[PDB]
A paper describes a structure:
Cytoplasmic polyhedrosis viruses (CPVs), like other members of the order Reovirales, produce viroplasms, hubs of viral assembly that shield them from host immunity. Our study investigates the potential role of NSP9, a nucleic acid-binding non-structural protein encoded by CPVs, in viroplasm biogenesis. NSP9 robustly binds to single- and double-stranded nucleic acids, regardless of RNA or DNA origin. The disordered C-terminal region of NSP9 facilitates oligomerization but is dispensable for nucleic acid binding.
Accordingly, we expressed a truncated NSP9 (NSP9ΔC, lacking residues 287–320) from BmCPV1 in E. coli as an N-terminally MBP-tagged protein. The purified NSP9ΔC existed as a dimer in solution, as confirmed by SEC and analytical ultracentrifugation (AUC), with a precise molar mass of 60.5 kDa. The purified NSP9ΔC was crystallized in an orthorhombic space group P212121, with unit cell dimensions of a = 82.4 Å, b = 83.6 Å and c = 184.4 Å. In the asymmetric unit, four molecules of NSP9ΔC were identified and organized into two virtually identical dimers, with a Root Mean Square Deviation (RMSD) of 0.6 Å. The final refined model achieved a high resolution of 1.80 Å, exhibiting favorable stereochemistry parameters and refinement statistics (Rwork = 0.18 and Rfree = 0.20). The overall structure of the NSP9ΔC subunit revealed a compact architecture composed of 8 α-helices (α1 to α8) and 13 β-strands (β1 to β13). The NSP9ΔC homodimer exhibits a distinctive awninged ship-like structure. The dimerization interaction of NSP9ΔC involves an interface area of approximately 1536 Å2 (11.5% of the total solvent-accessible surface per protomer) between protomers A and B, and approximately 1177 Å2 (9.6% of the total solvent-accessible surface per protomer) between protomers C and D due to the lack of the awning-like β-sheet II pairs, both larger than the homodimer interaction of MRCV P9-1 according to the PDBePISA server. The arch-shaped structure contains six positively charged amino acids, specifically R9, K10, K12, K20, K23 and R28, which span residues 8 to 28 and form the tunnel. The elucidated structure identified a positively charged tunnel surrounded by a compact NSP9ΔC dimer as the nucleic acid binding channel, thereby suggesting a plausible interaction potentially between the protein and the nucleic acid from both termini.
Numbering used by the authors:
A (entry chain B): -2 to 82, 111 to 284
B (entry chain A): 0 to 84, 111 to 284
The structure:
């Protein structure tokens, strides 16, 4: 699929139902999707990725989180904030049962590059499709601006945080991607034709970008000694466009790979 | 004083679920106080300039036209009719039981001016509060950006259409108000800190604003003759920012005054 149809999937099982005075509203027919993310998850689950093989046991849920040094696959214990069915992970108890670090050179940069290329392609494809005065297919247009977008926002947030961990100061992500990190959810019509920022934020961002990210350890267990390793650094807070408040990432923007 | 534009979210009109978890309803909703004030004054016959003369035995609505403000009582077959719980109006049957035109000079401009001043005040306040580096209370910030906004978007749509009917060509509304007319609704976080448009749209709008509106008759009955009067012109379509598709106003952006 090309153009905007590369970023649309059929909304087979609606992940959103809206209710109003006894009526259940009709679910959107489609959802926004970043195909490179779907492909990555599939390859990791099936052990068919060309550069990275998850070695953790698949009898427990596996998550992944970006750190400054690469990509961490991890199995949270039931007490970890990332666990899917108590003090936050700290230097004495990480609440991580096991982990696997993949450094940039060993495949994490290849993964990030594939994700980033797709995300930037989406941003550019939105300009070509919605902002260039070009004739548009009516059905495709309405599929786009009514599409479910919650999963897509989470995919783009994951790509953003990888870009920041790898290269916040040297290859900063564009504001069109940063916005996913400081707004939990953006509706598809705003993604396609609007923004979670305005023009002043655009000029500001080139100047502010080195100051928008706070990092903190992604705690994991020491293998031969008690306590936690503290040297793996994840995104902890992202400064919002008002430059006063932050969006907090309790688990560094981690996402689930398999259950 | 963003709190001037907030009301308690007493009886939310919708509830939303994500993957079967109901989201917490917002504590507050955005509101345009000049709109609430206007409706109350029209209902209670305490408006300083305009008195509705239609019978209150039936529901009363109002709609902007190029020559002012039309109060009307729709019949059950009219698209604006609201029940306790079919062909569109045309030059033969308006489905309007009675109407009252108030010209700009006889009070409609005063009404529009009070609404417009409030809406422009909101737009300017959003800049002062969210884009000026001003210290803000964290709780108040989150109350604003999580607020429900559907009713507010409808209020802003009404002000916008009045601005267009009165002075599309001579005093065009700003894009910060036009956006409410080409989006079904905008969430509060996007209203406060983002937009339903992007930077290129600002320059497009400066050039296009005299060409974005299609008008059509608001059909009302001829009083001495069969059929409908066809010379009262309401907003029928507003061109979206992509410049291809339009938002349709089946009843010219009419709103209910009294039930």
């Amino acid at each position: 699929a090309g153009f905007m149809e590369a970023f649309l999937l059929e909304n087979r099982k609606p992940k959103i139902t809206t209710l109003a005075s006894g009526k259940t509203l009709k679910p959107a027919t489609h959802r926004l999707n970043l195909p490179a993310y779907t492909k990555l998850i599939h390859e990791l689950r099936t052990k068919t990725h060309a550069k990275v093989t998850i070695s953790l046991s698949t009898e427990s849920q596996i998550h992944m989180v970006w750190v400054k040094s690469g990509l961490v696959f991890f199995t949270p214990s039931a007490s970890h904030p990332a666990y899917v069915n108590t003090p936050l992970p700290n230097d004495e108890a990480s609440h991580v049962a096991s982990f696997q670090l993949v450094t940039w050179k060993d495949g994490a940069l290849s993964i990030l590059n594939d994700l980033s290329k797709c995300a930037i392609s989406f941003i550019n494809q939105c300009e070509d499709t919605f902002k260039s005065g070009t004739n548009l297919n009516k059905e495709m247009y309405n599929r786009c601006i009514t599409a479910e977008s919650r999963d897509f926002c989470n995919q783009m947030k994951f790509v953003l945080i990888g870009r920041l961990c790898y290269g916040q100061t040297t290859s900063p992500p564009p504001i069109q991607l940063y916005q996913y990190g400081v707004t939990p959810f953006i509706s598809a019509d705003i993604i396609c034709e609007g923004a979670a920022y305005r023009s002043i934020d655009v000029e500001n961002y080139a100047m502010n970008s080195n100051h928008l990210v706070s990092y903190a350890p992604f705690f994991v267990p020491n293998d031969t000694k008690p306590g936690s390793r503290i040297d793996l650094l994840m995104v902890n807070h992202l400064k919002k466009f008002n430059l006063i408040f932050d969006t907090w990432y309790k688990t560094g923007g981690s996402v689930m790979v398999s259950s």
